[PDB]
Design a protein around this ligand. Sequence first.
Ligand SMILES: N[C@@H](CCC(=O)O)C(=O)O
Lengths: 61, 94
Amino acid sequence: GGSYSDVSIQVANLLRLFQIPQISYASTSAKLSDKSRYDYFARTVPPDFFQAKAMAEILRF
Amino acid sequence: KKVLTLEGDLVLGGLFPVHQKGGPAEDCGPVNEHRGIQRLEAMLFALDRINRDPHLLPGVRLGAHILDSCSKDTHALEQALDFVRASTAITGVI
Ligand SMILES: N[C@@H](CCC(=O)O)C(=O)O
């Protein structure tokens, strides 16, 4: 679960206390890549670090 | 791993930054001599003054369950489970 990044972050903060794995399907925020804090989180979507590059390159073109 | 415990009828929790954030190898490093220790001793001093006050809670004695955050939010959150594991019960948190 987790469609909005805010919901995923809030849920991940709680689940790491009880050691429960979590996989998202639509959360693309970059903050979740820091495994020192969200050490039980995974996702099947890329982070937002590349979307900014794509948008900037569209503007440059 | 340490906790400061004082017996009473109603227990108030506490959270103070006794230790500075150690870094990657260790969560807690050196001690705060001003914002870590003095503030905690202030809370203990206030508790002692209240516990010999006849006008304020003459028949109820207040306990304490004080923890350390080590200036980190993840460490603080891991420690805070002691406050909610009861539901000894914790009435309020300073
Ligand atoms: N990736 C969006 C969710 C949008 C969607 O549900 O497709 C977010 O992180 O808020």
